[PDB]
Design a protein around this nucleic acid. Structure first.
Lengths: 130, 121, 86
RNA sequence: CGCGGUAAUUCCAGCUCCAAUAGCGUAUAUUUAAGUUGUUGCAGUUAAAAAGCUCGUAGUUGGACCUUGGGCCGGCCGGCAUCGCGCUCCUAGCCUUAAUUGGCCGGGUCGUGUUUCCGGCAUCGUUACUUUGAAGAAAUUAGAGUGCUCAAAGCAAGCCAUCGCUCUGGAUACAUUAGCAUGGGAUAACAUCAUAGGAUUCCGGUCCUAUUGUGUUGGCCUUCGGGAUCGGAGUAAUGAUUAAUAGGGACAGUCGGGGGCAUUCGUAUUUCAUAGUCAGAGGUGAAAUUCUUGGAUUUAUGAAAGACGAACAACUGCGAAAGCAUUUGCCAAGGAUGUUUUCAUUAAUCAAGAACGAAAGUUGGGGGCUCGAAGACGAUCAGAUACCGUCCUAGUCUCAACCAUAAACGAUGCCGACCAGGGAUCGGCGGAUGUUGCUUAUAGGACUCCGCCGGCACCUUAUGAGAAAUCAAAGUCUUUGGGUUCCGGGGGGAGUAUGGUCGCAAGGCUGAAACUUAAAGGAAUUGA
RNA sequence: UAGGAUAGGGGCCUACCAUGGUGGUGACGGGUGACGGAGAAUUAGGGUUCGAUUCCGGAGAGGGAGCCUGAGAAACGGCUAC
């Protein structure tokens, strides 16, 4: 498939476990989710281990929780690629109610909901951060 | 880590067209060379070798599929009772077409030849 | 303890690299090796692959060396070996 | 859904009350409810619902390297420097030598014509998506503005010196597949340099084109520029990215109750002949039919016949599945495992289509030991056609053929990643100067181990799901959208009718509706 | 390919010529108060359903065929025939 959903699903079940990470193989649209987490500070650090010689690429996560409250309350997928379900800057369906953001791959690149909306450029949702 | 170590401490040139470019025009048997010989030379075969030009190789998977198929067919002329064997034959021939789907796109001649080739060598 | 991943991830125990498959490894390599196997009959010692596969004989002496098995080679009778290769 | 079987808040009148109110009932269609149509937004362990199984297409879906990343200033945006290709011309940014020319001048000072000089970027392999813009009927609809007096709506209107006219409007959005044009270059493809027919400053000769020069017009080109053509010589990281917790193939030692064929054995059961000998035997809960000097039953020995592989044989194996246990040989086969071997995206999963597919029935042979539908007998039984007893045909067995179905089951699609502790056992591998072994010694192998790939599964908690029972999957679907496919969408009728299709036949496969009716069904719980 | 026709290309028809075209992306066939659209109803939305209607475009004007006039009608409150 495309990984993406697997990372999000694995993240929330691992939060219930109270583990300090799970570590897994990563791809290039799942490079994107981690960098977006850093910006909105679900991660205050991320590291991409063995992406140099090996068969795959990977990244152990160091992840917020093991603190008091979880930072990522829910992240759950909202369709991978290979499909036509589409939003515009005006169409905006949302989760949360502005506490979270809606992950969007826009024309220029992956940016958060407010950035894309201001520029007035649509795109396709990758997932729902609550 | 692994790959850099091989490249540096092996050989690369001279030792490899002599050892390996003989054995392959003698008849295939790429895996045979790695399981014998003077180790360091074949250390870097995976880490630096596309494959020299050769008869076979691209043709090996296709040839092997026909070669195994004919013997199963021979044992399907004697007793019908081999209900297990007929479904191995059914499975393997449907895998056989896959091999000559993929190894038909990169090079010429294969497109015409490999359809006909089934059951006649 | 609470561990999924280790307290020192970077250096795991070798037993936990024997867990995960060769492809899956943190630092992947051949767990297989080259070795020089030593034979009285030959003056020099011959470098050999750990998983022999073929019944390898020593180059000058017709002594044998090892016999093959499902994993790493099962050496036969009195022979000695050091594990090294460049 | 229910009420009315004589003190009916359910009827029929009256009263009173409720409640919409110039309006309200009723019917049919239709939208909602109904996530009962599941794009948003479904369910399939057990409630309706995974196709017997695999191969596998059309079709969907599909990994990563991938002129991308970084750094500076100015005020996310603009413009820069690296690793922001290029040329004809157009368009075209300022200045230097200021020169023809003009004014100065112990200055080549400055500006224009003119040489050098740069912003700013049209064409030079395809798209999808997205952006902006045009093209875009009025009405309708949303909606600007406005006292149609309100208002539904309409596009009118408000001010005056109200007897000498003043002015504002009649916006905008919607305009939906697609098409155009422009901008973007992320994400997805077509696609793409290895037999190089690649780029090129080098140059030839061949050959075409004709404007400038030429007054003009007509026949024929030199030089020359630009094409077309065929060769020689040059430059450069010259010309194939890894080798998916994606897939195949090669190879190694294995594993298995995998397959087939040949083959070998065991006792049993049946029958026969020979043997011995004297009352029961079949049978059961109890009896009898039935068999018994035509000395059974039993007993032993051979042989024949046909069947089958006990106990061993397991919360254990293999095979796509259906299924598969004596030995041995041959023949090809398959998974797991190991692999710095090879190919490099071949892949994933599927309508169609194709292969195999227990039993029974069957087509013909072999073959009929055993058992055994129907039938025929005895009890039981009002009936007993059965359980039960006894006889026994087809058949069971095998072979070439049909067939296509099963509670063909894990009632649980296939594939992938993840979320949780622990011990067995099956297989392989690795490490032990362990044990046994004694293999010359060893290595192995069986045993004990720990680690481990991939298993069949269990165990205990279940974070979590669920209606619960339960479940490491029925989790990771309300945290609603991983990829693909199939099916259901109240119960009955009805899985039939009908048609098509197929089958040798049985009959299968595909598969309604009239009409009926309010629950059918599940799990748990409490009674009896 | 050719011609005649008509305002014109045109299988438009017709000669000669070839033997094709099109389909699982559902063609071909059947059904449909099946006109199409702008639009309507009702749905938060998404949708679902509807479109006979003073508008927009076409068809028909008892059913069918054929034709005159005229810029233009295969007219129907014209004709001609059945």
């Amino acid at each position: 498939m495309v990984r993406v959903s697997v990372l999000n699903d694995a993240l929330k079940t691992m939060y219930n476990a109270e583990k300090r990470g799970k570590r897994q193989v990563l791809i290039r649209p799942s490079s994107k989710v981690i960098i977006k987490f850093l910006i909105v500070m679900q991660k205050h650090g991320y590291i991409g281990e063995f992406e140099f010689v090996d068969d795959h690429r990977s990244g152990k996560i160091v992840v917020e929780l093991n603190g008091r409250l979880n930072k990522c309350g829910v992240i759950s997928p909202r369709f991978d690629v290979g499909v036509k379900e589409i939003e515009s800057w005006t169409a905006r369906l949302l989760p949360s109610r502005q506490f979270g953001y809606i992950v969007l791959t826009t024309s220029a690149g992956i940016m958060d909901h407010e950035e894309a909306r201001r520029k007035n450029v649509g795109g396709k949702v990758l997932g729902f951060f609550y | 880590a692994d790959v850099e170590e091989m490249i540096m401490k092996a050989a690369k040139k001279g030792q490899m067209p002599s050892q390996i470019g003989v054995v392959l025009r003698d008849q295939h048997g790429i895996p045979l060379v790695k399981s014998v010989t003077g180790s360091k030379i074949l250390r870097i075969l995976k880490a630096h070798g596309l494959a020299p030009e050769i008869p076979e190789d691209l043709y090996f998977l296709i040839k092997k599929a026909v070669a195994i198929r004919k013997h199963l067919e021979r044992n399907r002329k004697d007793k019908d009772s081999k209900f297990r064997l007929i479904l191995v034959e059914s499975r393997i021939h449907r895998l056989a077409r896959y091999y000559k789907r993929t190894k038909k796109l990169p090079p010429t001649w294969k497109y015409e030849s490999t359809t006909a080739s089934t059951l006649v060598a | 303890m609470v561990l999924s991943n280790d307290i020192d991830l970077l250096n795991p125990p070798a037993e936990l690299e024997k867990l995960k498959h060769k492809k899956k490894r943190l630092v992947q390599s051949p767990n297989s090796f080259f070795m020089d196997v030593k034979c009285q009959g030959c003056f020099n010692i011959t470098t050999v692959f750990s998983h022999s596969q073929t019944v390898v004989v020593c180059p000058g002496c017709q002594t044998v060396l090892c016999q093959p098995t499902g994993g790493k080679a099962r050496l036969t009778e009195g022979c000695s070996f050091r594990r090294k290769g460049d």
